[PDB]
Amino acid sequence: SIQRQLTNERMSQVVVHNGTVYLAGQVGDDMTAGVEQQTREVLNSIERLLDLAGTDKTRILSVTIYLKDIDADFAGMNSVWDKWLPKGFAPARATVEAKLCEPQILVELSVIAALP
Amino acid sequence: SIQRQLTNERMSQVVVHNGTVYLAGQVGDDMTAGVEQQTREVLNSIERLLDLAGTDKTRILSVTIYLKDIDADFAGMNSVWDKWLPKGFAPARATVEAKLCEPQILVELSVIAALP
Amino acid sequence: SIQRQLTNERMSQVVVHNGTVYLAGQVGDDMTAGVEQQTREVLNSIERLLDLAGTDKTRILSVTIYLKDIDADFAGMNSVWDKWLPKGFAPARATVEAKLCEPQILVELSVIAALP
């Protein structure tokens, strides 16, 4: 049916429904760091959540990327993103400017993936 | 196949495909009210649409929340959101700042849910 | 399983999983043009991608529309959008203000569709 993982009153980090994995929005850990390091931390977090969900980063379907300042940080975010996935397995992607819930958060990813 | 409900030339409020429910973006009713009351009105609207789609608020998979001013209204929106769903059934969630189509609209939700 | 089309290191334009089509974010071609012409170009691009994915514009499930300036361009975007699809087949829709990766880009669409 529906499986939920890492749940509190506000959200589940992982929701799995009929083979599709929906992740809560993910942000980085170090609030003093630039967009490159925050993006690395986001991608590490996503990998951990995909492990728990029962899939892996070659089965990502669609990612929406929110940047606090797209003019400042698009290129730095891309420099990390473009190295993340094996060639041939990149998902659909969309990248837009939207402030996150704290001013030090420079990047947030919303991920949809697939179970094997 | 695909079922559509509450359809005009621009959008359907409800689209159901192979067990997944996609709702049009939902906003509140009272444009003079604060983010808490607008969020309550949004959640009521979502519940009505889920009723029509054939599911309920314990089967929500992923919600993206847009706030006109995330610094001003994140906490007020959360105060309503956090009370909405039974413990254990919260969906994936992402919350970002994006202006809605009228300046008095403080919050808009995009919902993906599942049929039983 | 998962089919990917028009793939580079950063993204696939088309990802198909278990009957659901996820498109990469689409923008227009003419950066000097207004939101109406850019929206037309976006919709043409979407139609080409849906052709490749094996579906068509009457099987769109959900679209999120990002506008650089929602106050300026909501109405112009709508004037094109509202004419696009046969009556009765409109998807779920959400429209918000989010800057795209270049200042001349006025509109970007993220599309989820269904295979027949």
Of C9, C15, C18, the CB nearest to A82: C9
Instruction: Give the separation between CA A75 and CA A39, rounded to whole angstroms.
Output: 12
CB distance A23–B92 less than 8 Å?
yes
Q: Which domain holds residue A21?
A: 2-114
Is A70 in Cβ contact with C10 (below 8 Å)?
no
Cβ-defined contact of B25 to C62 (cutoff 8 Å): no
The alpha helices in chain A, defined as continuous H runs, are: 35-53, 70-81
Min Cα distance B112 → chain A (Å) is: 10
What is the CATH classification number for the domain harbouring C97? 3.30.1330.40
Query: Is A109 in a helix, a strand, or coil?
Result: strand
**Cα-only R_g, chain B:** 14
Q: Which residues contact A82 (CB under 8 A, 6 or more apart)?
A: C9, C10
Q: What is the DSSP letter of A71?
A: H
Count of domains for chain C: 1
Our CA angle for C109, C41, C60, nearest 5°, is 45
| Contact (Cβ atoms closer than 8 angstroms) between residue A64 and residue B66 | no
| C88 alpha-carbon distance from chain centroid | 19
Resolution in A: 1.6
> Distance from A57 to chain C by nearest Cα, in Å?
13
* Residues on chain B touching C59 (C-beta within 8 angstroms): 2
Query: Experimentally, how was this structure solved?
Result: X-ray
